[PDB]
Paper text:
The ScpA enzyme is one of two multi-domain cell envelope proteases (CEPs) produced by the Gram-positive bacterium Streptococcus pyogenes. ScpA inactivation of human C5a (hC5a) results from a single proteolytic event between residues H67 and K68, releasing the 7 C-terminal (C-ter) residues of the chemotaxin associated with receptor activation. The structure of ScpA showed that it is a subtilisin-like protease with a PA domain inserted within the catalytic domain and 3 tandemly arranged C-terminal fibronectin type III domains (Fn1-Fn3). Based on proximity to the active site, the PA and Fn2 domains were proposed to participate in substrate interactions in the active site and at an exosite respectively.
To circumvent potential complexities expected when measuring substrate binding to an active enzyme, surface plasmon resonance (SPR) studies utilized the S512A active site mutant of ScpA (ScpAS512A) and recombinant His-tagged C5a peptides. The sensorgrams observed for ScpAS512A binding to immobilized rhC5a were well accounted for with global fitting of the data using a 1:1 Langmuir binding model. The equilibrium dissociation constant (KD) derived from these kinetic parameters was in the low nM range (34 nM) indicating that ScpA has a high affinity for rhC5a. The analysis confirms that the substrate binds to ScpA at a single site with high affinity (KDITC = 30.8 nM). The ITC measurements also indicated that the binding of the substrate is an enthalpically driven process with a ΔH of −9.4 kcal/mol and ΔS of 2.3 cal/mol/deg. Binding of ScpA to the larger core portion of C5a (rhC5acore) was also measured by SPR. rhC5acore represents the larger N-terminal product (PN) of ScpA inactivation. Thus, the high affinity binding of rhC5acore along with the competitive binding data indicated that the bulk of substrate interactions occur at a site outside of the ScpA active site (i.e. an exosite). ScpAS512A binds to rhC5adR with a KD of 191 nM, intermediate in value between the KDs for rhC5a and rhC5acore.
Numbering used by the authors: 97 to 1032
């Protein structure tokens, strides 16, 4: 009972054509570096173990002895070697991601599988080297771990190394030297390394669009940033093998549609369904009990939509897209609730259908994708931090069905699924070249295979924009193993280093030079054309879509046999400067593809991308403007309150810093009750000694005298925020600290203080590496970073507190790009240690209960708050509230205080305290009874 494979029904990358030419991997070794594997899975088997490189643990150990490897172990005929390079970690091993990635590369499920179709990877007859690596300490130790796994994989005979992991926005230059030399070691040995681009979209994450003022929104990190690697983006073909559900339309026909199910529905059981809108209100699920809730994708989370139907008593849920030509999204598991994602067109069909009955099928079929041929929304954009072109190539990575833990199978999306397909195509192409080009070195075949894969890759085309997807999103195009296995030509840059042209900074007139390489015995003629395109802009945001400018005339080129010729396409986009600079004031990309055809009417034979930037890329601002300078009071990750644009509350009692992510200075607010308790030596203060809290706030913000619930920005006459410290060790506004939202990566971040008289009085420790805030999510990164090394305690380089005055707090940082000038941002910081002189005597009129102070406060900095506090006990907890002064200078003291429980507590005169604070933080707190006693 031999079952058909998934590839037998769906092979979007044409792997079968290459397999018919180069085999299925028998005798070859490939390696996978991931976070953990199910090394017992049924997908790990060989058809003929006798044809393998390592036929036993003895063959594996002999190879270990020859290279000094004293670790790792044979597992079975398929998994010839497994080693855990992060065994010292305390976290448990996750087996799903690594098993899935490996299955796409070399899965070989037998016919005895429970699945409808067998999972057969690109190289099912190759042996696997599974190597675990996970973060335990830092990213340097991490890169040192997988550098060893690379070297070991090379020395154990791996022809391909697939690395379906990464860390966003990281620069290649910051990798340890061992990691860099391991990349070169594999390359010098003809071993291919394939990296996933990442699932981080652009700056802002898969839910935001980057602002047009900042074109350097790439988020590709390491190891993908290594030039030696082949970095793979993710796209969706126009069709995909999917699970199905069928209904009856109004025309009396049977229409079956794709579904993506979390948990399982009853196979071929007729389900009823009712429309429940966006699933936000309880009334939406009025007639949802017993049926399936049809919920529109909208404003609440999927977990909220699904759980709300569970309360109403539904048997399942159907969430349909709110985007046009969108992608399926894996819905969460909410208490085993069967949840299926469907397209917007299929959802609207179900919404306006008469006989609202749907039946889920057990056998999957190939159906068109709603997205059509489209790049994945999560696939990481270039460029690298160093400014290099990534990714290199695209591969299918939407809802890929592969092997998961416990001998099971599941669909996963991600560039981690795109990579192992290209890795398998690299391995087969290299085998093909071992007979097609035997006189080459292994490094020469590797360089050729990478160039052929990129050249023959079909440049994907956005049908809505009438332009090709940006090279910064798709690389050199979608991999095509048929065109790659058949290619006898390839195209490289001017210096024959890569199949991509990096032009760095360009003006309106530039030229793209490409070398066409012919390896056939006969000369060949080609027609070539360069497309000119840039970014599409929607107002203040990038659309993350191409904007075609024009295309050049088709020109001919004849390349002699076993030779190469260069072509040059002049580009002139000067007639677009005015419009493009209006949308993208700080510069814009000028990019595209030089496409090659045997004849202009035939299909694309090769394509090489070129990328230039119209401006000064390296000197683009790396730091978002301070939040104080915002016209409307909002930044990229922070929205203002339109009713009060100067409101800027602090951290409060939040646990995570998900709010208030912008460039600013931080300080601390320390109430007087805590200053008093600390100076008196109280050990336990929080929720015991005082009801007030020490809050981290932003410098230049001050609370109103009556509310205290909100802080507001105050500014000098010029406009700068009134940032002031009082360095006296009491914890109340003693320091300033730099908080940054970095639009670009930076290096050598250092803060200094100028005395505004021509002298630097203080310099902080240097923060050598700065990573951009490419998102505002705990799962990746927050939209802001607090650099504790930039904290200034108001002291000079000798340790003495600076004299009272205004100082320039200067933050310096340099972009990663080559030769970039150092950038800086300045803040005026006032230092004032002057303790306010306040009253020492007071008389209290018993009739009106008005307290009269012997003298008004005399403060150096302007008065911040002049209040009288009363601290009463509310359920054994001293609770403090405040009283503002009258207009004659007196304070009316109440005789009772209403508690939270609704009661009333009498106020004794020993409960009142006179507190005066200036805008630098200098504070005095005197008991009112002490003032009343202030008389000889
Ligand atoms: Ca202070
Ligand atoms: Na291409």
């Amino acid at each position: 009972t031999s079952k058909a494979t998934i590839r037998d029904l769906n092979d979007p990358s044409q792997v079968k054509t290459l397999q018919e030419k180069a085999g299925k991997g028998a005798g070859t070794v490939v390696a996978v570096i991931d976070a953990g594997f199910d090394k017992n899975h049924e997908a790990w088997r060989l058809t003929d173990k006798t044809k393998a490189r390592y036929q036993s643990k003895e063959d594996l150990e002999k190879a270990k002895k020859e290279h000094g490897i004293t670790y790792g172990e044979w597992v079975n005929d398929k998994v010839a070697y497994y080693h855990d390079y992060s065994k010292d970690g305390k976290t448990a091993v996750d087996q799903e991601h690594g098993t899935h990635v490996s299955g796409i590369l070399s899965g070989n499920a037998p016919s005895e599988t429970k699945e409808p179709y067998r999972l057969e990877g690109a190289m099912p007859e190759a042996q696997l080297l599974l190597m675990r690596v996970e973060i335990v300490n830092g990213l340097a130790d991490y890169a040192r771990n997988y550098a060893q796994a690379i070297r070991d994989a090379v020395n154990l005979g791996a022809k391909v190394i697939n690395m379906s992991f990464g860390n966003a926005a990281l620069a290649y230059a910051n990798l340890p030297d061992e990691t860099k030399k391991a990349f070169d070691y594999a390359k010098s040995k003809g071993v291919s390394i394939v990296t996933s681009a990442g699932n981080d979209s652009s700056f802002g994450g898969k839910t935001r669009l980057p602002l047009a003022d900042h074109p350097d929104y790439g988020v590709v990190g390491t190891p993908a940033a290594a030039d030696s690697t082949l970095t793979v983006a993710s796209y969706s073909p126009d069709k995909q093998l999917t699970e199905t559900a069928t209904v009856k339309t109004d025309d009396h026909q049977a229409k079956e549609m794709p579904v993506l199910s979390t948990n399982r529905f009853e196979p071929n059981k007729a389900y009823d369904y009712a429309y429940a809108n966006r699933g936000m209100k309880e009334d939406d699920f009025k007639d949802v009990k017993g049926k399936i809730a049809l919920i529109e994708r909208g404003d609440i989370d999927f977990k909220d939509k699904i759980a709300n139907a569970k309360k109403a008593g539904a048997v399942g849920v159907l969430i349909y897209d709110n985007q046009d030509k969108g992608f399926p999204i894996e819905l969460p598991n909410v208490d085993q609730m069967p949840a299926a994602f469907i397209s917007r067109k299929d959802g609207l069909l179900l919404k306006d259908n008469s006989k609202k009955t749907i039946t889920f099928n057990a056998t999957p079929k190939v159906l068109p994708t709603a997205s059509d041929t489209k790049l994945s929304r999560f696939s990481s954009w270039g460029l690298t931090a160093d400014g290099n072109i990534k990714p290199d190539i695209a591969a299918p990575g939407q809802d890929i069905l592969s092997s998961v833990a416990n001998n099971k199978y599941a669909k996963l999306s991600g560039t981690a699924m795109s990579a192992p397909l290209v890795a398998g195509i690299m391995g087969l192409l290299q085998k093909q070249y071992e007979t097609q080009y035997p006189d080459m070195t292994p490094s020469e075949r590797l360089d050729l295979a990478k160039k052929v894969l990129m050249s023959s890759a079909t440049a994907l085309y956005d049908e809505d924009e009438k332009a090709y997807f940006s090279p910064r999103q798709q690389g050199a195009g979608a991999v095509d193993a048929k065109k790659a296995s058949a290619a006898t030509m390839y195209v490289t840059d001017k210096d024959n280093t890569s199949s991509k042209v990096h032009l760095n900074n360009v003006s309106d007139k530039f030229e793209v030079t490409v070398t066409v390489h012919n390896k056939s015995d006969k000369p060949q003629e080609l027609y070539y054309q360069a497309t000119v395109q840039t970014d599409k802009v929607d107002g203040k945001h990038f659309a993350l879509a191409p904007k075609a400018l024009y295309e050049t005339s088709w020109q001919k080129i004849t390349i002699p046999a076993n030779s190469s010729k260069q072509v040059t396409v002049p580009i002139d986009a000067s007639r677009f400067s005015k419009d493009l600079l209006a949308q993208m004031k700080n510069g814009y990309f000028l990019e595209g593809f030089v496409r090659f055809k045997q004849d202009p009417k035939k299909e694309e034979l090769m394509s090489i991308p070129y990328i230039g930037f119209r401006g000064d890329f390296g000197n683009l601002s790396a730091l978002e403007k301070p939040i104080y300078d915002s016209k409307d009071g909002s930044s990229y990750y922070h929205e203002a309150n339109s009713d009060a644009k100067d409101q800027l509350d602090g951290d409060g009692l939040q646990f995570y810093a998900l709010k208030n992510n912008f460039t600013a200075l931080t300080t601390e607010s320390n109430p007087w009750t805590i200053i008093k308790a600390v100076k008196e030596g109280v050990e336990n203060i929080e929720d015991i000694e005082s009801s007030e809290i020490t809050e981290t706030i932003f410098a230049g913000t001050f609370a109103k005298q009556d509310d205290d619930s909100h802080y507001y920005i105050h500014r000098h006459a010029n406009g700068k925020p009134y940032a002031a410290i009082s360095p006296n060790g009491d914890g109340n506004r003693d320091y300033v600290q730099f908080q940054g939202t970095f639009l670009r990566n930076a290096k050598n971040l250092v803060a200094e203080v100028l005395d505004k008289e021509g002298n630097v009085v203080w310099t902080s420790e240097v923060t050598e590496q700065v990573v951009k805030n490419y998102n505002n999510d705990l799962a990746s990164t927050l939209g802001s970073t607090r650099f504790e090394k930039t904290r200034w305690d108001g002291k000079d380089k000798d340790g003495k507190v600076v004299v009272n005055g205004t100082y320039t707090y200067r933050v310096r940082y340099t972009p990663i790009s080559s030769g970039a000038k150092e950038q800086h941002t300045d803040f005026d910081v006032i230092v004032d240690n002057t303790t306010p002189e306040v009253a020492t005597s007071a008389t209290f009129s018993t009739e009106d209960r008005r307290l009269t102070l012997a003298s008004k406060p005399k403060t150096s900095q302007p008065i911040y708050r002049e209040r009288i506090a009363y601290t009463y006990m509310d359920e054994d907890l001293p609770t403090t509230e405040y009283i503002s002064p009258n207009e004659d200078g007196t304070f009316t003291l109440p005789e009772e205080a209403e508690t939270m429980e609704g009661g009333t507590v009498p106020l004794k005169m020993s409960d009142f305290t006179y507190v005066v604070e200036d805008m630098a933080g200098n504070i005095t707190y005197t008991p009112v009874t002490k003032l009343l006693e202030g008389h000889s």
